[PDB]
Design a protein around this motif. Sequence first.
Motif, mmCIF file in Angstrom:
data_model
loop_
_atom_site.group_PDB
_atom_site.id
_atom_site.type_symbol
_atom_site.label_atom_id
_atom_site.label_comp_id
_atom_site.label_asym_id
_atom_site.label_seq_id
_atom_site.Cartn_x
_atom_site.Cartn_y
_atom_site.Cartn_z
ATOM 1 N N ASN A 189 13.694 109.075 57.584
ATOM 2 C CA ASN A 189 15.074 108.759 57.936
ATOM 3 C C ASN A 189 15.062 107.681 59.007
ATOM 4 N N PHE A 190 15.593 106.506 58.676
ATOM 5 C CA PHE A 190 15.641 105.383 59.607
ATOM 6 C C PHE A 190 17.029 104.762 59.538
ATOM 7 N N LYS A 191 17.770 104.839 60.640
ATOM 8 C CA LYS A 191 19.110 104.274 60.735
ATOM 9 C C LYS A 191 19.140 103.284 61.889
ATOM 10 N N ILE A 239 12.302 113.388 54.256
ATOM 11 C CA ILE A 239 10.985 113.040 54.774
ATOM 12 C C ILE A 239 11.057 111.857 55.733
ATOM 13 N N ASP A 246 25.761 95.583 66.630
ATOM 14 C CA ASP A 246 27.135 95.124 66.787
ATOM 15 C C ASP A 246 27.164 94.012 67.823
ATOM 16 N N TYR A 247 27.768 92.882 67.460
ATOM 17 C CA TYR A 247 27.922 91.747 68.362
ATOM 18 C C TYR A 247 29.383 91.326 68.362
#
Lengths: 50, 50
Positions: free
Chosen positions: B33-35, B31, B39-40
């Motif tokens: 989905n957050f990704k 239902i 990167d530093y």
Amino acid sequence: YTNCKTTEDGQYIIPDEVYTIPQKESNLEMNSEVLESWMNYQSTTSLSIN
Amino acid sequence: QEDHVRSSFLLDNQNSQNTVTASAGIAFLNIVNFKVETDYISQTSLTKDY
């Protein structure tokens, strides 16, 4: 460009009337917004008359 | 005949590397989905000769 002034890293030929300072700065910004919406509906109506 | 030769060589090198990786993933029952990832990478090099 009589003297052909070169920077410390030896990458560019700057004129004799300017001076360079190694000011290295990095800025990395990644913004990933995922908005997901889902719905499913099922209805079943049965009528029997005998 | 008297000959006096004096030679002095000096070199210094300083390197600093910083890597920061931050990842966050929230996945519900198919239902939401957050990704997100950040990167530093920074690398600073200083060389001095004499």
